Amino acid sequence: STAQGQLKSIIERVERLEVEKAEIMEQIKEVYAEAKGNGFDVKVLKKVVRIRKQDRAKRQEEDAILDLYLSAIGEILEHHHHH
Amino acid sequence: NSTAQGQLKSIIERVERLEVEKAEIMEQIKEVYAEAKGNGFDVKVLKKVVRIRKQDRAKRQEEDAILDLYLSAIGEILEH
Amino acid sequence: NSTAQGQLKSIIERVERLEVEKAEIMEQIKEVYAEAKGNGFDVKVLKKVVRIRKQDRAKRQEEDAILDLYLSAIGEILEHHH
Amino acid sequence: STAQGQLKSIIERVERLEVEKAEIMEQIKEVYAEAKGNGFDVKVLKKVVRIRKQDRAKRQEEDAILDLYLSAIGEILEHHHHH
DNA sequence: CCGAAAAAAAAAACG
DNA sequence: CGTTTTTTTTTTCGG
């Protein structure tokens, strides 16, 4: 039936995507293992990745607000030029 | 603290790319579930179905692992 | 602040006693495994057996939970035709 | 055989102990939940409990070193009670 | 936001 | 010692 087929496609797509996600997580562990093999401190590395992630989030908030300012300026410009 | 730092950069950049890909996957999963809800499905029940199937596969590999432990223990006893 | 201080110490003290008890339990578990090891058992295999049995109990609990979801969803569909 | 019975008592004792352990973890979680219900921040509470645990480890190590000093002094005292 | 469920990070046991 | 699981903290995600 159509509902059985929809169910099957849902479970199938989710399970494939989660396979891919597990592959990504495993590759990340590969990078950390190689970093450790070259003498790096994995724990501080993970802390660095977390900190850079947090700073990146702040920058994106700043960029969205920045775009608000740019939008208001854009309206002021179009109004200035015509009339 | 010189020529290791160039490698450090490759490390962090590779990690950041991989986590980008990971977030893209998570987003696709969320999209599939939201479309399922839009087609009248209960996302919570769907996730429980996926969860149980995942646990069953994990158990099956676990039992393969205990089997391998048994065969190894026997071989260790018989070799020495 | 002030009045909360009496509650704070009672909380931390009860939790810390409970953590004492939990650590004592972990010690007893290690004792059982060590004595079995002294009797020739393979501790790793034993832990795997305990772990598999626990996974079976978890799986059965999950099956009961999804069963309840099915029953509730059926009740939802039927009770909201009227 | 006797090894079958030993196996069974082992598995049952461990499983009984892990039952007890899960009940204790539940009591801890409940205490934190009611504390939160009284307006506390659970995360900071857990951080404090962890810090006190770390202090307890530090003091017990230092107390063991203290015992080394006390024992050596005791040896000097037994030597003294001879002169 | 909450409460459960996944994942990351931290801690510890085993050889 | 270190590694390779276990335990805890942090994060996710639907409601």
Short mmCIF file of all heavy atoms in Angstrom, two decimals, chain B residues 7 10 51 53 56 66 73 77 80:
data_model
loop_
_atom_site.label_atom_id
_atom_site.label_comp_id
_atom_site.label_asym_id
_atom_site.label_seq_id
_atom_site.Cartn_x
_atom_site.Cartn_y
_atom_site.Cartn_z
N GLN B 7 50.72 21.56 10.12
CA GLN B 7 49.97 20.28 10.18
C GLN B 7 48.77 20.49 11.11
O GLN B 7 47.66 20.10 10.76
CB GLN B 7 50.90 19.15 10.60
CG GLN B 7 51.67 18.54 9.45
CD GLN B 7 50.74 17.76 8.57
OE1 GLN B 7 50.94 17.64 7.37
NE2 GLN B 7 49.70 17.21 9.17
N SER B 10 46.09 21.79 9.10
CA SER B 10 45.43 20.78 8.27
C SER B 10 44.51 19.92 9.12
O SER B 10 43.42 19.54 8.67
CB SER B 10 46.47 19.92 7.55
OG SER B 10 46.65 18.68 8.23
N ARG B 51 15.20 3.50 16.19
CA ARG B 51 16.00 3.24 17.38
C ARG B 51 16.04 1.76 17.71
O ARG B 51 17.11 1.21 18.01
CB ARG B 51 15.41 4.03 18.55
CG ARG B 51 16.09 3.82 19.88
CD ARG B 51 15.63 4.85 20.92
NE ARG B 51 15.68 6.23 20.42
CZ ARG B 51 14.63 7.04 20.32
NH1 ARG B 51 13.43 6.64 20.70
NH2 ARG B 51 14.79 8.27 19.86
N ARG B 53 15.43 -0.80 15.63
CA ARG B 53 16.18 -1.51 14.60
C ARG B 53 17.68 -1.35 14.82
O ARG B 53 18.45 -2.32 14.71
CB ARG B 53 15.76 -1.00 13.23
CG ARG B 53 14.40 -1.52 12.80
CD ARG B 53 13.81 -0.71 11.66
NE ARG B 53 14.61 -0.77 10.44
CZ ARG B 53 14.58 -1.77 9.57
NH1 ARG B 53 13.79 -2.82 9.78
NH2 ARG B 53 15.34 -1.74 8.49
N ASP B 56 18.77 -3.56 17.71
CA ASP B 56 18.83 -4.95 17.31
C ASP B 56 20.11 -5.25 16.53
O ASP B 56 20.76 -6.27 16.77
CB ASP B 56 17.60 -5.30 16.48
CG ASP B 56 17.71 -6.65 15.81
OD1 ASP B 56 17.93 -7.65 16.52
OD2 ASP B 56 17.57 -6.70 14.57
N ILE B 66 30.69 -11.92 21.21
CA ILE B 66 30.81 -12.95 22.25
C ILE B 66 31.18 -14.28 21.62
O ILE B 66 31.99 -15.03 22.17
CB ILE B 66 29.52 -13.04 23.09
CG1 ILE B 66 29.76 -13.91 24.33
CG2 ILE B 66 28.37 -13.65 22.33
CD1 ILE B 66 30.58 -13.27 25.39
N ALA B 73 38.87 -18.02 23.36
CA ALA B 73 39.20 -18.64 24.64
C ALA B 73 39.47 -20.13 24.47
O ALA B 73 40.42 -20.68 25.06
CB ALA B 73 38.07 -18.41 25.63
N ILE B 77 43.03 -22.17 25.12
CA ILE B 77 43.17 -23.35 25.95
C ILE B 77 43.82 -24.50 25.18
O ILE B 77 44.69 -25.21 25.70
CB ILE B 77 41.79 -23.77 26.51
CG1 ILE B 77 41.27 -22.72 27.50
CG2 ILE B 77 41.87 -25.13 27.17
CD1 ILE B 77 39.84 -22.98 27.94
N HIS B 80 47.95 -24.19 24.24
CA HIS B 80 48.97 -24.22 25.28
C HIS B 80 48.61 -25.19 26.39
O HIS B 80 49.44 -25.97 26.85
CB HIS B 80 49.18 -22.81 25.84
CG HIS B 80 50.31 -22.71 26.82
ND1 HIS B 80 50.54 -21.57 27.56
CD2 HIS B 80 51.28 -23.59 27.16
CE1 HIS B 80 51.60 -21.76 28.33
NE2 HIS B 80 52.07 -22.97 28.11
#
